[PDB]
Amino acid sequence: SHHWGYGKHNGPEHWHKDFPIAKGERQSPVDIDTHTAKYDPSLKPLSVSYDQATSLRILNNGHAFNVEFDDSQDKAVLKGGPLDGTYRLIQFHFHWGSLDGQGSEHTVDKKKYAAELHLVHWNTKYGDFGKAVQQPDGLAVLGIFLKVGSAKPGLQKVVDVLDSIKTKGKSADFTNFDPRGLLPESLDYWTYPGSLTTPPLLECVTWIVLKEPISVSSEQVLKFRKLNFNGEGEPEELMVDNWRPAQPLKNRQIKASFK
Numbered sequence: 001s002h003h004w005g006y007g008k009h010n011g012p013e014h015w016h017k018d019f020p021i022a023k024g025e026r027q028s029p030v031d032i033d034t035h036t037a038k039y040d041p042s043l044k045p046l047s048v049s050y051d052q053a054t055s056l057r058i059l060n061n062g063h064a065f066n067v068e069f070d071d072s073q074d075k076a077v078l079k080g081g082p083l084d085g086t087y088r089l090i091q092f093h094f095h096w097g098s099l100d101g102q103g104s105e106h107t108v109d110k111k112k113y114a115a116e117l118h119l120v121h122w123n124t125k126y127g128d129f130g131k132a133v134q135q136p137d138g139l140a141v142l143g144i145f146l147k148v149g150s151a152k153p154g155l156q157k158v159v160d161v162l163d164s165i166k167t168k169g170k171s172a173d174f175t176n177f178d179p180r181g182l183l184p185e186s187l188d189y190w191t192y193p194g195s196l197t198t199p200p201l202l203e204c205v206t207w208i209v210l211k212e213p214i215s216v217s218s219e220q221v222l223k224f225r226k227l228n229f230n231g232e233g234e235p236e237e238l239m240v241d242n243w244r245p246a247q248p249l250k251n252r253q254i255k256a257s258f259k
């Protein structure tokens, strides 16, 4: 069984030994150089259709926490933009720092944000998530930066349940959560082909990274930082700095949806 994480001994610089694709040609995250990304008039309008989203549960997996959705039907889907066809929401999670000056996976002109939200969707032409991650167009991840400032009211229900899932393997019922409350006003975005940012690092993702960050309060992010990577009863290792740094861009171009 694998033992990867974010520490010195098991962090991103070690992942390649068990997961050689770590050094592949389309790894994520990347730095988004805003002066090299080009506006693409071919991109169709982005469609985020979350009205019928059905959240179920929140889980501390020892790496982050996942808010999981019922994806047994097209209840919450992402379409348009660079995407061909229909991508179903399965879960969201975050990456964050020990300090407000770090935490995001993607960077913007080398700027690190305090955190990054990933809304994970799978291409319904492949039938199930497990099949989709074996395809180069299997997933679409909508990435949203978080900066510290004013509180995000739509985040507070997530913050308040974290006390109940402090340690690895703990879960809690998490019904009726509306992920629309985590979006910024603008859907302007950058897009490029990449990968999962954790093991197994599969090169199956179309990344759609929104330009406009959301603002969360210091108190909200402080509560993320009280989570634990460890299991119950084990020595405490605070769940902080669960982000992979930027990877080589290699042959890829980042396209902008906006002028």
Ligand SMILES: NS(=O)(=O)c1ccc(NC(=S)Nc2ccc(F)cc2)cc1
Residues within 6 Å of the ligand: 091, 118, 120, 133, 141, 195, 196, 197, 198, 199, 200, 202
């Ligand atoms: N940070 S991320 O790139 O958005 C990201 C999104 C999703 C996942 N993996 C999930 S949900 N399960 C999974 C399990 C077994 C596999 F073989 C493959 C994937 C990891 C990272």
Ligand code: NA
Residues within 6 Å of the ligand: 043, 044, 045, 046, 080, 081, 082, 257
């Ligand atoms: Na677009």
Ligand code: NA
Residues within 6 Å of the ligand: 183, 184, 185, 212, 213, 214, 215
């Ligand atoms: Na915003």
Ligand SMILES: [Zn+2]
Residues within 6 Å of the ligand: 093, 094, 095, 118, 197
């Ligand atoms: Zn992620």
